[PDB]
Design a protein around this nucleic acid. Structure first.
Ligand SMILES: [Zn+2]
Length: 463
RNA sequence: GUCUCUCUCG
RNA sequence: GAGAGAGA
C-alpha cells in the first residue's frame, strides 16, 4: 500500500473527522501486584513520550507497492484456492438489505454502537437514527444510500490500547479505518452469504479461522494440520499489500461464480480515500482496517499468498497437500515435508511482504506443536484426555492487561475474562494468578472462577 | 473509537 | 436490551 496524495479538507470538501486524544486507560488496583511494561498508546502528536514525529510514524506502515498484475504463480495460487472454495457452494447472489442490516444465523446484525462512519459521524447522525432492531426498517437506509451514495472515505481513528514502550517512543500506534455505513451495507449485500459460509466453517476448506472459538477449535487444529507445521509473522501485513493481491482476489471471486458487478467492488477496496483530522488522503493498495469483511478478505488473500509463495520458491510443490488456516495475517499451515520459511520470506520480499520468524528470534527455526502459536495462544494437550487441546495464553499478556482499566467499575468482568483465558495454563499457574489477585483488598471482593468448574465446563463442550 | 469469539448485567 | 475482555 502507498499513499498517493494528501490534501487539506478545504481542498477536497470533506468533513473533519476527529477522535479522542486522551487515553481512557488508567492504572488499576493490580498495577503493582503484577509486572508489566506496556502503557497506553500515543494518541496525540504532542505526547511527551514520543521520540519521533507522530504522524510520520502513523503512516510509515504504507511501505509502497511492488507488483500490480498477477504473475503465473499468483494466478495458479488463486485458481487453486478458488477451486477449493467451490465445494462450499457459496451463494453468490446478493443478500437482501434487510438480512444485511439486521443479521442472519451466521452473520451478526450491524452493531448499533459502532460508528456509522463518514459523513454521519461528522454530522451527528448515529446508527440508531437509521436502523431499528424492532421494526427491521430498511426504508431510511435506502434513503441514505441514495442521499450519500458509495465509495465514501474511510474515517481514520487512532486506537486507544496498551503498547510496548518501544512502540510508544516510535509513535507506532494502530489505526482504525472505519468504512461508512453505506459501504458496509453495500459490501454485506454483495458478500453477506460468503461471510455466512466463512463464519460457519472455520477450518482448512475456507482456510480461515474467522468465527472460530479457540476453546473448541484448538482440538481440531492438529487434525486439520497434519504433518510438518510452518508459520511466520508479517510486519504490517494489511498496509504492505500491493494491488496484485486485490487483482488475485478478483480472480478468486470470479472463479467461484460472482457477477462482474460484485467483483467490481474489489477495486473500491484496493483504491480508497481516508479522512484523518482535517486532511484527506488516497491509499492505493493496502487493506483498510475497519472495513466490513477486513478479516475475511485478509484471510482469503493470505490463502493466495501462501500458495503463490510455495510454488514460486520450491520446485515440485503439490498444493493439494497444503493445509492452512488464516485469521487475517495470522497463519498456521502444514505440509507433508518441512517448509523452509527463510526461502518463503525471500520470495515474499519480492511481492512486497516482510516476513519474520514465528518465534520472534532472528532465525527461522522449526515450528512444532510445542512452540506454535495462533491468535496469540499456544497448544497444550490436556493431561487427562490428550486429544483435547488447551489454547494457552502466556501469563505475561494477562499480567499486562490486568494492571490497567478503562473504568474500574468493570473490574469484576475484566478479571473474570482474564481468568477464563488463564486457567488453560494449568492448575498451579492459575491458582498462583488467583493468589496474587486476592493479595489486595479489591481482589478479595471479586467472584473468581474456580479451576475445577472451569475445567469441567470446558470438558462438557466436547459433550 | 473495525470485526470475530467469550464472559457479565437488566 | 446494556457492558466488558481478549484476539486479528
Ligand atoms: Zn485516490
Amino acid at each position: 500500500g502507498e499513499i498517493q496524495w494528501v490534501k487539506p479538507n478545504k481542498e477536497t470538501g470533506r468533513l473533519n473527522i476527529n477522535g479522542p486524544t486522551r487515553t481512557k486507560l488508567e492504572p488499576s488496583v493490580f498495577h503493582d501486584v503484577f509486572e508489566g511494561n506496556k502503557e497506553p498508546a500515543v494518541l496525540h502528536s504532542k505526547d511527551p513520550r514520543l521520540e519521533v514525529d507522530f504522524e510520520q510514524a502513523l503512516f510509515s506502515k504504507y511501505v509502497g507497492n511492488t507488483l500490480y498484475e498477477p504473475d503465473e504463480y499468483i494466478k495458479e495460487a488463486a485458481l487453486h484456492y478458488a477451486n477449493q472454495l467451490k465445494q462450499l457452494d457459496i451463494d453468490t447472489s446478493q443478500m437482501s438489505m434487510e438480512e444485511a442490516c439486521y443479521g442472519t444465523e451466521n452473520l451478526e446484525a450491524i452493531d448499533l454502537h459502532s460508528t456509522a462512519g463518514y459523513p454521519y459521524s461528522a454530522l451527528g447522525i448515529k446508527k440508531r437514527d437509521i436502523l431499528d432492531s424492532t421494526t427491521r426498517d430498511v426504508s431510511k437506509m435506502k434513503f441514505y444510500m441514495d442521499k450519500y451514495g458509495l465509495d465514501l472515505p474511510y474515517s481514520t481513528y487512532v486506537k486507544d490500547e496498551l503498547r510496548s514502550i518501544d512502540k510508544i517512543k516510535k509513535g507506532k500506534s494502530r489505526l482504525i479505518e472505519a468504512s461508512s455505513l453505506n459501504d458496509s451495507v453495500y459490501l454485506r449485500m454483495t458478500f453477506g452469504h460468503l461471510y455466512e459460509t466463512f463464519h460457519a466453517n472455520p477450518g482448512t476448506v475456507t482456510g480461515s479461522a474467522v468465527g472460530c472459538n479457540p476453546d473448541t477449535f484448538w482440538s481440531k487444529l492438529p487434525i486439520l494440520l497434519p504433518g510438518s507445521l510452518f508459520a511466520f509473522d508479517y510486519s504490517g501485513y494489511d498496509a504492505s499489500l500491493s494491488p496484485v493481491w486485490f487483482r488475485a482476489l478478483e480472480l478468486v471471486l470470479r472463479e467461484i461464480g460472482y457477477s462482474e458487478e460484485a467483483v467490481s467492488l474489489v477495486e473500491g477496496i484496493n483504491h480508497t480515500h481516508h479522512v484523518y483530522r482535517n486532511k484527506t488522503y488516497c491509499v492505493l493498495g493496502g487493506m483498510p482496517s475497519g472495513m466490513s469483511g477486513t478479516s475475511i478478505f485478509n484471510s482469503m488473500i493470505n490463502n493466495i499468498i501462501i500458495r503463490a509463495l510455495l510454488i514460486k520458491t520450491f520446485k515440485g510443490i503439490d498444493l493439494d497437500e497444503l493445509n492452512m488456516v488464516a485469521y487475517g495475517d495470522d497463519v498456521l499451515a502444514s505440509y507433508p515435508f518441512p517448509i523452509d520459511c527463510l526461502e518463503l520470506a525471500r520470495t515474499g520480499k519480492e511481492y512486497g511482504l516482510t516476513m519474520t520468524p514465528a518465534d520472534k528470534s532472528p532465525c527461522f527455526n522449526e515450528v512444532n506443536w510445542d512452540n506454535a502459536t495462533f491468535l496469540k495462544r499456544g497448544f497444550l494437550p490436556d493431561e487427562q484426555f490428550p486429544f483435547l487441546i488447551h489454547p494457552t495464553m502466556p501469563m505475561k499478556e494477562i499480567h499486562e492487561s490486568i494492571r490497567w482499566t478503562k473504568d474500574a467499575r468493570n473490574t469484576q468482568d475484566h478479571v473474570r475474562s482474564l481468568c477464563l483465558l488463564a486457567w488453560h495454563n494449568g492448575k498451579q499457574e492459575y491458582e498462583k494468578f488467583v493468589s496474587a489477585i486476592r493479595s489486595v483488598p479489591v481482589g478479595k471482593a471479586l467472584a473468581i472462577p474456580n479451576y475445577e468448574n472451569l475445567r469441567r465446563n470446558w470438558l462438557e463442550l466436547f459433550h
